[PDB]
Structure 1
Amino acid sequence: KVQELSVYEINELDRHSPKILKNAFSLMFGLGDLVPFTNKLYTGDLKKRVGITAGLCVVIEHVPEKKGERFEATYSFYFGDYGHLSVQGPYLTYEDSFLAITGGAGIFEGAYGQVKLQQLVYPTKLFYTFYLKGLANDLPLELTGTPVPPSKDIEPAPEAKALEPSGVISNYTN
């Protein structure tokens, strides 16, 4: 059985991210350029802070006909005491993509499948949908609420942004 899990990734500009390591000779992004990053992670219903994203984007090429970039990404999604999911695959600044779920830990031990990446604001807001197989149990209800409709206007609940107990999961990752 497949369990669907959606989350919002938001860059609130307070984690030094992204860091651009410019090694390609061009003013535009190119092969050689490396981009370590870490953003905040919220539930799909935007009610609770769950953790962070964390990893590395490797520039593969500039795509002038689409006015954007192709990256190859290696990173994880942290859900506090619930554990984490790890992924590998493409991030295209100009269109949606699917990444491979490489594994997980905690409640995500044994995870496999794929995840859809949808960019809403380049690069500060993204919406993910994980198609999770291999989990030992049903996902906890506080992670499976109906998602807010994805758009460039989405915002976390005020309590979540402010890190009030009602707006965070237990030991949310920071």
Structure 2
Amino acid sequence: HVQELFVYEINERDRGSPVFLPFGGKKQPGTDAHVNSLGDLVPFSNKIYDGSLKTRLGITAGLCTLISHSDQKNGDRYEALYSFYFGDYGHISVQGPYITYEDSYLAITGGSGIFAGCYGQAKLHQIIFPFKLFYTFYLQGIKKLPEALCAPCVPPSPSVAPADEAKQCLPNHVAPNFTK
């Protein structure tokens, strides 16, 4: 069956991320300003927390390929490949659409550890692009998730933040060997 796993992803401005590479080369008439376009590439890596926001789990890491810019929607479509690292729990890998202005569903391409053999889809919700994102992994194919990953979930909103003890990576507020 499906097990839902909720994850908060936060850019805390402390990992030199993201790196925007303007390889699409598109320029705005009259100003010659860069215009986001197919081919711009964006390596990134943020921090992740559990749904209760009380536990630092690890990081995301991967690469987004910019596909198109929408002036009307004021944002961009990307094609993304990245992983979520949960310390000793293992990792989940995803592939698919990352849209700056709306929610999307990514493929869960697999994982390791407690996630070995996982499959299904994951909902990406932009809370406040690009600093705060919320995921619902609809995980299939694995054993029952540990209770630590299934605490009551904080409902997402732009003001949400990790607990101080999770931001500080203190005991009781980190995944085992959480990914740094």
Whole-angstrom distance in 2 between the partners of 1:98 and 1:29? 22
1:101 to 108, 111, 114: 108
User: May I ask how many residue pairs the two structures share in their alignment?
Assistant: 173
Provide TM-score, normalisation by structure 1: 0.98
1:161 maps to: 167
Runs of 4+ in structure 1 over 4 Å off: none
1:173 to 152, 175, 179: 179
1:86 paired to 2:93: yes
For residue 29 of structure 1, report the CA deviation from its aligned partner. Answer: 1.1
Unaligned 5+ residue runs, structure 1?
Answer: none
Whole-angstrom distance in 2 between the partners of 1:76 and 1:170? 18
1:7 paired to 2:7: yes
1:47 maps to: 54
1:33 maps to: 40
Whole-angstrom distance in 2 between the partners of 1:28 and 1:68? 11
SS of the residue 2:69 aligns to: strand
For residue 28 of structure 1, report the CA deviation from its aligned partner. Answer: 2.1
Q: CA deviation digits over 1:36-95, x for unaligned, max 9?
A: 000000001101000000000000010111111000000000000000000000001110
Identical columns (%) = 61
Whole-angstrom distance in 2 between the partners of 1:19 and 1:31? 16
Give 1 or 2 for the bigger CA radius of gyration: 2
For residue 122 of structure 1, report the CA deviation from its aligned partner. Answer: 1.2
1:121 maps to: 128
For residue 121 of structure 1, report the CA deviation from its aligned partner. Answer: 1.0
Whole-angstrom distance in 2 between the partners of 1:5 and 1:24? 35
SS of the residue 2:166 aligns to: helix
Whole-angstrom distance in 2 between the partners of 1:28 and 1:152? 27
Unaligned 5+ residue runs, structure 2?
Answer: 28-33
SS of the residue 2:172 aligns to: helix
